[PDB]
Write a protein that binds this ligand. Structure first.
Ligand SMILES: [Mg+2]
Ligand SMILES: [Mg+2]
Ligand SMILES: [Mg+2]
Ligand SMILES: [Mg+2]
Ligand SMILES: [Mg+2]
Ligand SMILES: [Mg+2]
Ligand SMILES: [Mg+2]
Ligand SMILES: [Mg+2]
Ligand SMILES: [Mg+2]
Ligand SMILES: [Mg+2]
Ligand SMILES: [Mg+2]
Ligand SMILES: [Mg+2]
Ligand SMILES: [Mg+2]
Ligand SMILES: [Mg+2]
Ligand SMILES: [Mg+2]
Ligand SMILES: [Mg+2]
Ligand SMILES: [Mg+2]
Ligand SMILES: [Mg+2]
Ligand SMILES: [Mg+2]
Ligand SMILES: [Mg+2]
Ligand SMILES: [Mg+2]
Ligand SMILES: [Mg+2]
Ligand SMILES: [Mg+2]
Ligand SMILES: [Mg+2]
Ligand SMILES: [Mg+2]
Ligand SMILES: [Mg+2]
Ligand SMILES: [Mg+2]
Ligand SMILES: [Mg+2]
Ligand SMILES: [Mg+2]
Ligand SMILES: [Zn+2]
Lengths: 97, 43, 85, 72, 60
RNA sequence: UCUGAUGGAGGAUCGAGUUGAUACUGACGUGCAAAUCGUUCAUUUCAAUCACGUUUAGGGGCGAAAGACUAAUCGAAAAG
RNA sequence: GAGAACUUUGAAGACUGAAGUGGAGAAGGGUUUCUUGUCAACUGUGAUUGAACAAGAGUUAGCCGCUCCUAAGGGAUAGCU
RNA sequence: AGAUGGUAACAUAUAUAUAAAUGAACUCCUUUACAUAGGCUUUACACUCGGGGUGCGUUUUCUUUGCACUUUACCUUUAUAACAAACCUUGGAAUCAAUUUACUUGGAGAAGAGGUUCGUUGAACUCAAUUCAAAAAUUUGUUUUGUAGCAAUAGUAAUUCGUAAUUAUCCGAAGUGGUAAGGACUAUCCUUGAAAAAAGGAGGGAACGGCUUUGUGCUUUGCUACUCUUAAUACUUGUAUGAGCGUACCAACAACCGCAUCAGGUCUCCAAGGUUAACAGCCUCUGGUUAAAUAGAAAAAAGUAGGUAAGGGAAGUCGGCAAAAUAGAUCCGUAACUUCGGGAAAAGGAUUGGCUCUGAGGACAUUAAUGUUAACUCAGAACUGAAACGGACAAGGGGA
């Protein structure tokens, strides 16, 4: 099952660097309680403007959002950015107001 | 209370009407005023 | 285990009330609360509902009787006399 | 409120002169579901056709003196 | 005297007065709103906000 | 004749609330108050408690009786 | 606003803690409700506040009650006193 | 001139709407219509838990995270399903059986097998429909729909775009038993726990189609669409649908009674999380306030509501008044005396935290093994700490 992040708007303002984000995602993603897994159960790839998560295990879109938020907090982009649902499989960064 | 007899309601209305002060123009040609909290109608 | 030795049914009253009175109550209580033999169905199911009323759970027939026992001896005697007559 | 299942019964009801208004509703189902409501003087009869084309046909069939309400 | 306005906001939204945020900037604009429709408009604008519920976390 | 359960009886027990008012003879005593406040205490399935309605009226009523109470009035109300 | 410890708004910090100064009602109250004013006195301090004062305005039912029935009871009819 | 089914319990009119199942006098019932206590069950709301979906919150560090929303009304005798009863048919029960938490019941017919009804409940159940394929004169198999209609068009949480509109969400599992209601019961009484209006049922069998003609409502003669029943309509007759009254607000915190905006008094319903036996007390969320006939500054005496005091322990005092001590629970242990019921929580002891484990107690559903999985309560063992633990709150002093 595919889950998406349309990272365009802040990626095209340089402030968002997809490569770092991908790494962060890799680090974070717990699998039955351990971060270092990400085996045959989850895959993460990236376009220039889009992050892709594909899951075989019970996985929550909420989790992705949370991760994104965490990332934002880390890189100080909290008052500028927002995670928003577009389509059911599709999350997207949007500018705060 | 919030469920009055018609007669009682009418009486209340009358009392209210009585309450209002002299129309000022007359003064150019009251002691019986009442306050709902200090003097009861004893109805 | 059997709880009371001499008290029996009057265990609800406890310590209060003269012991003699309680003893008397006990007999009367026993009389009241025993399922009497119904002289219609045969099943020992006639129980006291009111003061002088005795209803059976089987027939639903209300039989007039004594206050505590279903039949007072005097009444029985009277009945017997009538029968003889 | 009343639900209807006999198409024929529904038709009969429609044919009846106390039926001033009709309603037709479209619902995205969890395809396009369609409710046919007839509003009689005493009851509002409703038929749920799961199949769009059939629903459309039935609507077409409905007397053109009915005062049809397209809700959505 | 924003009393009335606050009251109106309370009813319209379904929240208690304790929960309406009237922005201290544009207190003149708000006081002018003597009606429920106007209150609604204000809310839409973002000159009146439903305060966030005080948190009661089950976690512990 | 005992033993373990079950059972859920009782004007039983403790006890919030409620109804009261034991003590401090506490505070207050030109008070918050013409009887209040605080702490303590008694009461809580019954002779229970409360509401509304209703009955009984003054040498009368009502009283689990204190001459109690009968509109802050009682060993005979109040009003004229 | 002339003037603000006790008007209003925001931000804190707090209490009431579902036997609540929360919702609804009954008795009793009777316009206390609401808006616009507004401060002589009153609001035992102040007060621009107000259950104050002034002008208006507000209570919409075949279904919620009363309206009907009977209860403890009451007022009477016939009498009789 | 007045239906039918069903062995029976009893059922049947599903017309837009179950409208219609002759019935008079005169009767007989029933509903209305009923105490308290105890538990048990079922539903409902409430609360909670796990997941998915939305938005917000935290992010030095940690957290698949914390919070919020995920809604569904009367009405349709709602259709059904499920269950406590009651009844019917079959069946014939000692080697007594069925059975509840409890006892209750059974040759006056039990168990079992099949039914009927009322009552809860109100979409449970494949409920309905649809997709077609096979079997008789309609039934079985599969699929797609529907928050069963109401119903999504309404809410709620979002997201936008515009100066009101679109869009996406609205749902898969379960536990706690706090309320409330119902049910079947059981117990208590020298207490046996309203009445009527109104409605219903039954017995009973009075009366009996229409039209035309003739004679004095009655009788005779001839003919066959008639008696019902809803809804609609048209027409006359007074104008042939809904009379009047109450509805603000307060309900005490300043709207009531206490001479007042007086710490008093004044009836009822709703009732969240935590800790807990608890609707106790303590703290929190929703809602509500941050006000109370005053503020500020100092911080003497004295007062008042409190605290705490070495050693002693009632020597104080009319008198242990006041205060302190005691207390929750589990385990032990329990005298005199007694009306044998109690005394009794007698007296008097011991234990209690946190952490990490272990054992004990179910439900289903596969085929005795294997699974999915649910509370909370017990009991025991380590370790741990300034020897502490009903750590606050709450909570008997006891005896002769
Ligand atoms: Mg009144
Ligand atoms: Mg007064
Ligand atoms: Mg005294
Ligand atoms: Mg004193
Ligand atoms: Mg003094
Ligand atoms: Mg004397
Ligand atoms: Mg003041
Ligand atoms: Mg607090
Ligand atoms: Mg407190
Ligand atoms: Mg209030
Ligand atoms: Mg006002
Ligand atoms: Mg003043
Ligand atoms: Mg004003
Ligand atoms: Mg006035
Ligand atoms: Mg009514
Ligand atoms: Mg009459
Ligand atoms: Mg009478
Ligand atoms: Mg008389
Ligand atoms: Mg919608
Ligand atoms: Mg009102
Ligand atoms: Mg109002
Ligand atoms: Mg007061
Ligand atoms: Mg007075
Ligand atoms: Mg005051
Ligand atoms: Mg000392
Ligand atoms: Mg000593
Ligand atoms: Mg001495
Ligand atoms: Mg001395
Ligand atoms: Mg003492
Ligand atoms: Zn019998």
């Amino acid at each position: 099952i595919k889950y998406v992040l349309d990272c365009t708007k802040p990626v095209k303002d340089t402030i968002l660097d997809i490569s770092g984000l991908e790494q962060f995602f890799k680090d974070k993603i717990k699998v039955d309680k351990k971060t270092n897994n990400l085996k045959n159960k989850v895959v993460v790839t990236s376009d220039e403007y889009k992050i892709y998560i594909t899951v075989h295990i019970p996985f929550s879109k909420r989790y992705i959002k949370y991760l994104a938020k965490k990332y934002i907090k880390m890189h100080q982009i909290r008052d500028f950015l927002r995670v928003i649902a577009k389509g059911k499989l599709a999350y997207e960064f949007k500018y705060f107001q | 209370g919030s469920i009055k007899r018609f007669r009682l309601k009418q009486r209340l209305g009358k009392c209210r009407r009585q309450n209002r002060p002299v129309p000022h123009w007359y003064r150019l040609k009251n002691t019986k005023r009442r306050h709902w909290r200090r003097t009861k109608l004893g109805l | 285990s059997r709880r009371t030795k001499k008290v029996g049914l009057t265990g609800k009253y406890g310590t209060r009330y003269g012991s003699s009175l309680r003893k008397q109550i006990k007999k009367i209580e026993l009389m009241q609360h025993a399922k009497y033999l119904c002289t219609f169905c045969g099943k020992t199911a006639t129980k006291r509902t009111c003061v002088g009323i005795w209803k059976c759970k089987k027939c639903k027939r209300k039989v007039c009787g004594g206050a505590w026992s279903l039949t007072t001896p005097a009444a029985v005697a009277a009945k017997s006399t009538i029968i003889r007559l | 409120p009343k639900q209807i299942t006999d198409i024929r019964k529904f038709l009969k009801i429609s044919r009846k002169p106390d039926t001033t208004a009709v309603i037709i509703m479209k619902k995205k189902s969890k395809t396009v579901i369609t409710k046919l409501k007839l509003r009689t003087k005493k009851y509002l009869y409703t038929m749920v056709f799961a199949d769009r084309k059939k629903a459309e046909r039935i609507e077409n069939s409905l007397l053109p003196s009915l005062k049809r309400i397209y809700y959505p | 005297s924003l009393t009335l306005q606050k009251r109106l906001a309370a009813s319209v939204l379904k929240c208690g007065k304790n929960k309406i945020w009237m922005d201290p900037n544009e207190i003149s604009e708000i006081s002018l709103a003597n009606s429920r429709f106007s209150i609604r408009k204000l809310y839409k604008e973002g000159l009146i906000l439903k305060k966030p519920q005080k948190v009661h976390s089950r976690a512990r």
